[PDB]
Amino acid sequence: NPTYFFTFGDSYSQTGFSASGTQPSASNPMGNPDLGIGTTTNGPNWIGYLTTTENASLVLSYNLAAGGATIDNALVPAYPGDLASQFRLFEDVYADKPASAPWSAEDAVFGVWIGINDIGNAYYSTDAETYTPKLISRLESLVEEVYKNGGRKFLFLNVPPTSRSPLFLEQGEEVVKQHAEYLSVYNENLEGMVDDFTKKKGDVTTVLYDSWSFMTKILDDPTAYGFPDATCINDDGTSCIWWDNYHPGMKYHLLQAEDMKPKLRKLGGW
């Protein structure tokens, strides 16, 4: 009895899944590509680990996340495959519960990890207090589309401290600071929206996962987690926190998936 795990996000979540590629099944839960391909980690990412390593029952992953994504190109633009476009792909292919993915309220989980690129692109040019509500409102309206299709179980990850990635560290401490302060307001507004949605609907199961505090713990004490420091890069994905200057590696993603597992019990697959 599968859990249908539909995910939406950016390069922290991408796996290169195609809606026309091999589709998820019990024998092949990711569908396509093979587990550990198509990521920014050198191996599985958090979704691959939640689906195949940390799962308590059968999870089928339909991963619509796309590199570089922002929430909506009408707000902060970047790449064609924004979050809005990912929801449209869901609308086009899976929303009507095809025989390939015959989901229902009781067994579908919709996971969203977005905001890294909205913040990365807008932190110096917009006012967080007035602008981040616009971003969060658009996220909420996309979530409402899935609610209208019958979705009831939702997972939201807050934005991790990309302020402390090598890419940002190299821009100077005051840029790190400006980015981090803007990010904190976005994350607060995200939490507010998730709480408000949960209460207003009354028939949903939600999880807000605080990836920010988890990654910050590791950055603050890297050797406690088997990393030599909080700044080194290694494309093996395991010697350093960072796989490249802006993305954490497979070891980090596994530690995050393990941290998430108990928090996801209420969603049915863990």
Side-chain angles (χ1 to χ4, degrees), residues 109-131:
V109 174
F110 300 89
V112 180
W113 193 13
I114 200 66
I116 287 168
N117 301 306
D118 308 75
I119 295 161
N121 287 306
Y123 74 90
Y124 63 88
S125 62
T126 63
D127 177 64
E129 288 292 348
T130 47
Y131 197 72

CSV table of all heavy atoms in Angstrom, one decimal, residues 109-131:
chain,number,residue,atom,x,y,z
A,109,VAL,N,1.5,12.4,-0.2
A,109,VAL,CA,2.3,13.4,0.5
A,109,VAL,C,2.9,14.3,-0.5
A,109,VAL,O,3.6,13.8,-1.4
A,109,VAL,CB,3.3,12.7,1.4
A,109,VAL,CG1,4.2,13.7,2.1
A,109,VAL,CG2,2.7,11.8,2.4
A,110,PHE,N,2.7,15.6,-0.3
A,110,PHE,CA,3.2,16.6,-1.2
A,110,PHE,C,4.3,17.4,-0.4
A,110,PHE,O,4.0,18.1,0.6
A,110,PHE,CB,2.1,17.5,-1.6
A,110,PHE,CG,1.0,16.8,-2.3
A,110,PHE,CD1,-0.1,16.2,-1.6
A,110,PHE,CD2,1.0,16.6,-3.7
A,110,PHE,CE1,-1.0,15.4,-2.2
A,110,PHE,CE2,0.1,15.8,-4.3
A,110,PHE,CZ,-0.9,15.2,-3.6
A,111,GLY,N,5.5,17.3,-0.9
A,111,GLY,CA,6.6,17.9,-0.2
A,111,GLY,C,7.2,19.0,-1.1
A,111,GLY,O,7.4,18.9,-2.3
A,112,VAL,N,7.5,20.2,-0.4
A,112,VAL,CA,7.9,21.4,-1.1
A,112,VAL,C,9.1,21.9,-0.4
A,112,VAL,O,9.1,22.2,0.8
A,112,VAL,CB,6.9,22.5,-1.1
A,112,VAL,CG1,7.4,23.7,-1.9
A,112,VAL,CG2,5.6,22.0,-1.8
A,113,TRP,N,10.2,22.1,-1.1
A,113,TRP,CA,11.4,22.8,-0.6
A,113,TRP,C,11.8,23.9,-1.6
A,113,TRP,O,12.4,23.6,-2.6
A,113,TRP,CB,12.5,21.8,-0.4
A,113,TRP,CG,13.7,22.4,0.5
A,113,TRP,CD1,13.6,23.5,1.2
A,113,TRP,CD2,14.9,21.7,0.9
A,113,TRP,NE1,14.7,23.6,2.0
A,113,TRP,CE2,15.5,22.5,1.8
A,113,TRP,CE3,15.5,20.5,0.5
A,113,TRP,CZ2,16.7,22.1,2.5
A,113,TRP,CZ3,16.7,20.1,1.0
A,113,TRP,CH2,17.2,20.9,2.1
A,114,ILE,N,11.4,25.1,-1.3
A,114,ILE,CA,11.6,26.2,-2.2
A,114,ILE,C,12.0,27.4,-1.4
A,114,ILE,O,11.6,27.5,-0.2
A,114,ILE,CB,10.4,26.4,-3.1
A,114,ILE,CG1,10.6,27.2,-4.4
A,114,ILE,CG2,9.3,27.1,-2.2
A,114,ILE,CD1,11.5,26.5,-5.4
A,115,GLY,N,12.7,28.4,-2.0
A,115,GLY,CA,13.0,29.7,-1.4
A,115,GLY,C,14.5,30.0,-1.5
A,115,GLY,O,14.9,31.2,-1.4
A,116,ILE,N,15.3,29.0,-1.6
A,116,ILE,CA,16.8,29.2,-1.7
A,116,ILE,C,17.0,30.3,-2.8
A,116,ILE,O,17.8,31.2,-2.6
A,116,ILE,CB,17.5,27.9,-2.0
A,116,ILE,CG1,17.6,27.1,-0.7
A,116,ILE,CG2,18.9,28.2,-2.5
A,116,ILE,CD1,18.1,25.7,-1.0
A,117,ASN,N,16.5,30.1,-4.0
A,117,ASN,CA,16.8,31.0,-5.1
A,117,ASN,C,16.0,32.3,-5.1
A,117,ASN,O,16.5,33.3,-5.6
A,117,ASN,CB,16.7,30.3,-6.5
A,117,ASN,CG,17.6,29.1,-6.5
A,117,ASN,OD1,18.8,29.2,-6.3
A,117,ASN,ND2,17.0,27.9,-6.9
A,118,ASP,N,14.8,32.3,-4.6
A,118,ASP,CA,14.1,33.6,-4.4
A,118,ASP,C,14.9,34.5,-3.5
A,118,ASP,O,15.1,35.6,-3.9
A,118,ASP,CB,12.7,33.2,-3.8
A,118,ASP,CG,12.0,32.2,-4.6
A,118,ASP,OD1,12.4,31.0,-4.5
A,118,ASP,OD2,11.0,32.5,-5.4
A,119,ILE,N,15.3,34.0,-2.4
A,119,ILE,CA,16.1,34.7,-1.4
A,119,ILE,C,17.5,35.0,-2.1
A,119,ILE,O,18.0,36.2,-2.0
A,119,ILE,CB,16.3,34.0,-0.1
A,119,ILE,CG1,14.9,33.8,0.6
A,119,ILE,CG2,17.4,34.7,0.7
A,119,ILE,CD1,15.0,32.7,1.6
A,120,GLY,N,18.2,34.1,-2.7
A,120,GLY,CA,19.5,34.3,-3.3
A,120,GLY,C,19.5,35.4,-4.3
A,120,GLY,O,20.5,36.1,-4.4
A,121,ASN,N,18.4,35.6,-5.0
A,121,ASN,CA,18.3,36.6,-6.1
A,121,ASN,C,17.7,37.9,-5.6
A,121,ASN,O,17.9,38.9,-6.3
A,121,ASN,CB,17.5,36.0,-7.3
A,121,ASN,CG,18.3,35.0,-8.0
A,121,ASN,OD1,19.4,35.3,-8.4
A,121,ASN,ND2,17.7,33.9,-8.4
A,122,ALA,N,16.9,38.0,-4.5
A,122,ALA,CA,16.2,39.2,-4.1
A,122,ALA,C,16.6,39.8,-2.8
A,122,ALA,O,16.0,40.8,-2.4
A,122,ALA,CB,14.7,38.9,-4.2
A,123,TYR,N,17.6,39.2,-2.0
A,123,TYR,CA,17.8,39.6,-0.7
A,123,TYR,C,18.3,41.0,-0.6
A,123,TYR,O,18.2,41.6,0.5
A,123,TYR,CB,18.8,38.6,0.0
A,123,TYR,CG,20.2,38.7,-0.4
A,123,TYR,CD1,21.1,39.6,0.2
A,123,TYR,CD2,20.7,38.1,-1.6
A,123,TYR,CE1,22.4,39.8,-0.3
A,123,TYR,CE2,22.0,38.3,-2.1
A,123,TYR,CZ,22.8,39.2,-1.4
A,123,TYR,OH,24.0,39.4,-1.9
A,124,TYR,N,19.0,41.5,-1.6
A,124,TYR,CA,19.5,42.9,-1.5
A,124,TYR,C,18.6,43.9,-2.2
A,124,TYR,O,18.8,45.1,-2.0
A,124,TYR,CB,20.9,42.9,-2.1
A,124,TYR,CG,21.0,42.6,-3.5
A,124,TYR,CD1,20.9,43.6,-4.5
A,124,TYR,CD2,21.0,41.3,-4.0
A,124,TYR,CE1,21.0,43.3,-5.8
A,124,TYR,CE2,21.0,41.0,-5.4
A,124,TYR,CZ,20.9,42.0,-6.3
A,124,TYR,OH,20.9,41.7,-7.6
A,125,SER,N,17.7,43.5,-3.0
A,125,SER,CA,16.9,44.4,-3.9
A,125,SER,C,15.5,44.6,-3.4
A,125,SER,O,14.8,45.4,-4.0
A,125,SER,CB,17.0,43.9,-5.3
A,125,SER,OG,16.3,42.6,-5.3
A,126,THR,N,15.1,43.8,-2.4
A,126,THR,CA,13.7,43.9,-1.9
A,126,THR,C,13.8,44.0,-0.4
A,126,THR,O,14.8,43.7,0.3
A,126,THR,CB,12.9,42.7,-2.3
A,126,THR,OG1,13.5,41.5,-1.8
A,126,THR,CG2,12.8,42.6,-3.8
A,127,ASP,N,12.6,44.4,0.2
A,127,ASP,CA,12.5,44.5,1.6
A,127,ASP,C,11.8,43.2,2.1
A,127,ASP,O,10.7,42.9,1.7
A,127,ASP,CB,11.6,45.7,2.0
A,127,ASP,CG,11.3,45.9,3.5
A,127,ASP,OD1,12.3,46.1,4.2
A,127,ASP,OD2,10.2,45.8,3.9
A,128,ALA,N,12.5,42.5,3.0
A,128,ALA,CA,12.0,41.2,3.4
A,128,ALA,C,10.6,41.3,4.0
A,128,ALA,O,9.7,40.5,3.7
A,128,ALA,CB,12.9,40.5,4.4
A,129,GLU,N,10.3,42.3,4.8
A,129,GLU,CA,9.0,42.3,5.6
A,129,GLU,C,7.8,42.5,4.6
A,129,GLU,O,6.8,41.9,4.9
A,129,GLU,CB,9.1,43.4,6.7
A,129,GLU,CG,10.0,42.9,7.9
A,129,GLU,CD,9.6,41.8,8.8
A,129,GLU,OE1,8.5,41.3,8.8
A,129,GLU,OE2,10.5,41.4,9.6
A,130,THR,N,8.0,43.2,3.5
A,130,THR,CA,6.9,43.5,2.6
A,130,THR,C,6.9,42.5,1.4
A,130,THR,O,5.8,42.2,0.9
A,130,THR,CB,7.0,44.9,2.1
A,130,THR,OG1,8.3,45.2,1.7
A,130,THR,CG2,6.6,46.0,3.1
A,131,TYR,N,8.1,42.1,1.0
A,131,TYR,CA,8.2,41.2,-0.2
A,131,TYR,C,8.0,39.7,0.1
A,131,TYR,O,7.3,39.1,-0.6
A,131,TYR,CB,9.5,41.5,-0.9
A,131,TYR,CG,9.5,40.9,-2.3
A,131,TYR,CD1,8.7,41.6,-3.3
A,131,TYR,CD2,10.1,39.8,-2.7
A,131,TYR,CE1,8.7,41.1,-4.6
A,131,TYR,CE2,10.0,39.3,-4.0
A,131,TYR,CZ,9.3,40.0,-4.9
A,131,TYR,OH,9.2,39.5,-6.2
